[PDB]
C-alpha cells in the first residue's frame, strides 16, 4: 500500500533536507497520498489525529520552503487535485475571471458581476468558474450545473457559471484541515487553475501577492497552455483590478509582459475598498440585479460598485480584443448594461438551468 | 480571547512563515507554554483536539524547517518552558550526570547508564543519572523514583537513576504527537537539559552532530550555569565517546570555548567497530552489564569491546570529576571500581533503596 502515512512522511522528510529534495512531481504524488488519507478521516479517532498531524506537517514544511510558490510545483499540485475532479467533455473568445482570494479585503464579488456584464458584449462568451453563492441566490439551483449538463447548456448560453465545490471533490477532502491550519498553503492558489472546461482560451486571474504573481503567471501558462492570461494584483493588496490606486498586470500571450492600471485610465474616480465592500452572496446578488444590471446607474454617477464592475468588465473586453483601449472597454461595458444585453444573458442562463 | 489558545499558537506559527522568521527565543518559550496547555486540556475525540494537533504539528514542523530550534537561546528557552510542567527535586543545601541527545541513528550499547554505575563505585564521586529501560529490568520499579522520593534516596546512594517520564509531565503531553509526526523536533534535543536535581555539579552531554555541538555547549551553559560540562560528539556520528575513531569534546569550564580530541589509544585501548558494541535489548544489556562487566568477568587488556566502551566513558567521567585529562588514571579508577565490587555494590544499594519505597 503506497498511499500510506509512511509514504507521506518520506515526502515530508525530503522537505526537511538542506537543501530540500522534494521535486514538483514528488509534490503531485504527495498530494495524491494526502487526498487518499484525508478520505479515511470521518471521525476524531487517533488514526485521524495521526493523519492530520502528518498532513499539517507536510503542508507547513512546503510553505516554509516556499516551493508551493514555484510555477512547476503549483502546476503539479493543480494536476493532482484535478485527478479527484469531474471534467467537462465538449466537442470564438471564451473567458473566465477569478482570483486566488487570501488578500483579506472583504470586497464585492466583481469577478461574477463583470463576468455577467462581459457576457452581454457581442462576440464574447463567458464560462465563469468559482464560488464557495451569488448566482445561487437568484432562484438558480447551481447543483444542476455539472459535468453532464454543461455540454447541453453550452451552445445557447453567452454566460455560464460553474460552482467549483460540485466539480472538485479533492478540494472538499482538505476543507477541514485548511480551516484548522489557519495558515496559507498550496491549496489557497489552486482554485483559478482548476477550470473543468478546456475550451476557455483567455482569463483574468487575480492573485493576493506581488511576490507570487510572476510565478503564478508561469503556472497559468503551464496549466492553461492555450490561454492568453492577465494575472492582476492591486497595490493596496487585492486579487482584483483595484478601485483605489494602481494594479500591476502580468500578461502571458501564446514572454512575461507587465503593465499598470489605475481608475483614471478608464475615466473613473477612485473608490476606497470600504466603498466596494462585500455584503455576502444574497445582498451582493440583489445589488447586482437591482442596482447594476437594471441600468439604475450610469458611467458618471460615481457609484463605487457600478464603477468597480464597469472597470473590471473593461479589462475583460480589452483582454478579449487584444488591445489596451480601456475607455473603449468602458463604452462596451456601459452598452452591455444599458442595452439590457447583460441582464438578458444572465436570465438566459438562469432559465436554461431551471429548465434542466 | 485567552492567552492559552489556538489563536495565540497560530500567531507564533505565522512568525515562523515570515522571511526572515520573526519568532524570538522568548516567543518559542511562550509558544511551548501554549502547546503544553492546549495538549493538557485536550477533550478526547473532540473537533478541538483535531484542530490542536493540526496547529501543534504545524508550529513544530515550521520551527524544524527554520532550524531556529538548534540555536542556543532557543534550545534553552524551550528547555525552560518544558520544565515549567516538570516536578523539580527540592534537596537540603562531586555529583555528575552522563546522557546523550540520541538521534545519531546508532543502536549501540547503553554506555551512559553503564559508565554512570561504574563511576558511582569510585570513592568521592556521586552519580545522579537522568534519562530514558536497562535499570528497569534489575528488580526495582523506577515509577517509585519521583520528585517526592529522590530526597529520601539522596543521602545514602552513590548511584541514582531518575527516569525522565516520572518528572517531565510536559514531555508526557507531547509524547503522542511526537510519535505521529515521525520527524525530529525541538523535543529531540531537550532531554539532557531537563535534569530535575540542581545539585548536579558536572556532566557529559553527548550530541548526535558536529553542527549542533557548539550551540548545544552554549545552551548547556544557560540551562546549567554552575556546571563544568563536556559536550561530546563521536566523529563516526555518535552522541558518545566513540570506541572507534576520534571524539571531539567541547569543554564548558566556568572557572576559566576549549575543544580537544579523544581516541581509544589515549586510554590504552584498541579501537572497536560499533557493530561489536551493539545494544542486545534492555533485558539482555542488563545481563551483559551485570554478568560480563560488574561481576569482573572481563578485565582491562581482554579487549572485550562493550567492556572497553564502558571503561573509556567511565574514565572520561572520572577525569571530568577531578579537573584533569589523565585518561589512563581514569581507566585505573574505572578498573578498580569494577574489580573491587564497588560498582556492583553501588548499583545494588540503589536497587534496594528503591525497593524499600
Ligand atoms: Mg477578491
Ligand atoms: Mg547514544
Swiss-Prot record, chain A:
UniProt superkingdom:
Eukaryota
Concerning InterPro entries, the annotation shows:
Anthranilate_Pribosyl_Tfrase, Glycosyl_Trfase_fam3, Nuc_phospho_transferase
List its EC numbers. Answer: 2.4.2.18
A single Gene Ontology MF term assigned here is: anthranilate phosphoribosyltransferase activity
The record makes one more remark, namely:
Present with 1760 molecules/cell in log phase SD medium.
Q: How does it assemble?
A: Homodimer.
Q: Spell out the family assignment given in the record's similarity comment.
A: Belongs to the anthranilate phosphoribosyltransferase family.
What is the protein name for this chain? Answer: Anthranilate phosphoribosyltransferase
Q: Which organism is it from?
A: Saccharomyces cerevisiae (strain ATCC 204508 / S288c) (Baker's yeast)
- In the UniProt record, what gene is named as encoding this protein? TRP4
Amino acid at each position: 500500500h503506497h498511499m500510506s502515512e509512511a509514504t507521506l512522511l518520506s515526502y515530508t522528510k525530503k522537505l526537511l533536507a538542506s537543501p530540500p529534495q522534494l521535486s514538483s512531481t514528488d509534490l503531485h504524488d504527495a498530494l495524491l497520498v494526502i487526498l487518499s488519507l484525508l478520505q479515511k478521516c470521518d471521525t476524531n479517532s487517533d488514526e485521524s489525529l495521526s493523519i492530520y498531524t502528518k498532513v499539517s506537517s507536510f503542508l507547513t514544511a512546503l510553505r516554509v520552503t516556499k516551493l508551493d510558490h514555484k510555477a512547476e510545483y503549483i502546476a503539479e499540485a493543480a494536476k493532482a487535485v484535478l485527478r479527484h475532479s469531474d471534467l467537462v467533455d465538449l466537442p470564438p473568445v471564451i473567458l473566465d475571471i477569478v482570483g486566488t482570494g487570501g488578500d483579506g479585503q472583504n470586497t464585492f464579488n466583481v469577478a461574477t458581476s463583470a463576468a455577467i456584464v462581459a457576457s452581454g458584449i457581442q462576440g464574447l462568451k463567458i464560462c465563469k468558474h468559482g464560488g464557495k453563492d451569488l448566482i445561487g441566490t437568484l432562484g438558480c439551483d447551481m447543483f444542476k450545473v455539472n459535468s453532464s449538463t454543461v455540454p447541453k447548456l453550452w451552445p445557447d448560453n453567452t454566460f455560464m457559471f460553474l460552482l467549483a465545490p460540485f466539480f472538485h471533490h479533492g478540494m472538499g477532502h482538505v476543507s477541514k484541515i485548511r480551516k484548522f491550519l489557519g495558515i496559507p498553503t498550496v491549496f489557497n492558489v489552486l482554485g483559478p487553475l482548476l477550470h473543468p472546461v478546456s475550451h476557455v482560451n483567455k482569463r483574468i486571474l487575480g492573485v493576493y501577492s506581488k511576490e507570487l504573481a510572476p510565478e503564478y503567471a508561469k503556472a497559468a501558462a503551464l496549466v492553461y497552455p492555450g490561454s492568453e492570461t492577465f494575472i492582476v494584483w492591486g497595490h493596496v493588496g487585492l486579487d482584483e483590478v483595484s478601485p483605489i490606486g494602481k494594479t500591476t498586470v502580468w500578461h502571458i500571450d501564446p514572454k512575461l509582459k507587465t503593465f499598470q492600471l489605475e481608475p483614471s485610465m478608464f475615466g473613473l474616480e477612485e473608490h476606497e475598498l470600504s466603498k466596494c465592500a462585500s455584503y455576502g452572496p444574497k445582498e451582493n446578488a440583489r445589488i447586482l440585479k437591482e442596482e447594476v444590471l437594471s441600468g439604475k446607474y450610469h458611467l458618471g454617477d460615481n457609484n463605487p460598485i457600478y464603477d468597480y464592475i464597469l472597470m473590471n468588465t473593461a479589462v475583460l473586453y480589452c483582454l478579449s480584443q487584444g488591445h489596451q483601449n480601456w475607455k473603449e472597454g468602458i463604452i462596451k461595458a456601459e452598452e452591455s448594461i444599458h442595452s439590457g444585453n447583460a441582464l438578458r444573458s444572465l436570465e438566459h442562463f438562469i432559465d436554461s438551468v431551471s429548465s434542466l
